[PDB]
Structure formats: C-alpha cells, structure tokens
Amino acid sequence: RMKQIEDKIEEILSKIYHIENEIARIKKLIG
Amino acid sequence: RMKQIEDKIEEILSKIYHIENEIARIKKLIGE
Amino acid sequence: RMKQIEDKIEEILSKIYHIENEIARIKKLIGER
C-alpha cells in the first residue's frame, strides 16, 4: 500500500501542475 | 491511520475531477 | 514514512483550495453563474 500511495501522490502532483498551467493561460485570455 | 490516508486520496481525486470539469466549461464559454 | 505522506497530502489540499478560489473568481470575471 504505502508504495502505491506515494506513486499516486507523484501522479497527483503532475495533475495539479497541469491545471495551474490551464488557469494561467485562461487568465491571459480574459481580464 | 492508513484508512484515513486513503480516504484523503479519494477526496483529492474527486475534487481534481470536479476542477477539470469546471475548466472545460470555462473554455467552451470563452471559446468554441 | 507515514508522516511524510500525511504532510504531503495536506500540501496538496492546500494547493487545491487555492485553485478552487482561482476558478471562482474566473467564473465571476466572465459572468458564469
């Protein structure tokens, strides 16, 4: 378990970093 | 202690999914 | 081992809260409601 857990955490971290990029972008497109 | 950890993870998963949906609709609305 | 995991899970929930606020303000900005 703990092993997968960490692995799933690394995955999550990457998911987030993508989303922040979408957001950063979207912000340029608006106000 | 471990089960808590796990509940935490499903939580993070559900919300991320929510967020990816919002972002979708926001694009639609501001674009094609 | 277990603590480090917990520490990182809280860091994640923090980040995630912040993005949800970002979203809220964007939604406002374009009139989503």
Side-chain angles (χ1 to χ4, degrees), chain A, chain B residues 1-31, chain C residues 1-32:
Chain A
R1 194 59 54 258
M2 209 134 297
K3 215 256 115 185
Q4 300 156 201
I5 299 196
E6 316 194 295
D7 278 352
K8 184 69 103 182
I9 286 188
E10 255 72 50
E11 258 151 35
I12 282 159
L13 278 186
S14 286
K15 202 85 255 210
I16 287 175
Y17 166 112
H18 174 53
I19 294 171
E20 289 171 336
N21 271 267
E22 290 171 316
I23 290 190
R25 215 205 273 144
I26 284 162
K27 253 143 63 167
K28 270 48 205 158
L29 289 197
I30 91 175
Chain B
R1 194 135 168 227
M2 177 90 338
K3 180 99 175 147
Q4 217 155 273
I5 257 150
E6 309 177 324
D7 282 347
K8 260 71 147 231
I9 285 183
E10 216 278 278
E11 195 217 50
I12 295 169
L13 300 179
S14 181
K15 306 179 170 221
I16 277 174
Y17 168 73
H18 180 48
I19 294 175
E20 284 272 49
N21 281 181
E22 284 174 312
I23 301 214
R25 181 142 127 116
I26 285 172
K27 280 176 165 178
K28 233 194 57 270
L29 295 191
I30 89 167
Chain C
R1 232 267 204 93
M2 233 175 197
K3 234 264 132 327
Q4 286 289 198
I5 288 181
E6 294 166 337
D7 299 326
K8 179 107 234 116
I9 277 183
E10 308 301 318
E11 249 156 48
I12 294 178
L13 279 161
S14 280
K15 267 309 189 17
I16 279 198
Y17 173 69
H18 173 77
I19 286 178
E20 276 164 331
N21 282 161
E22 289 175 311
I23 289 187
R25 184 174 180 196
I26 283 169
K27 270 213 206 161
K28 259 203 220 41
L29 263 189
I30 57 159
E32 190 181 26

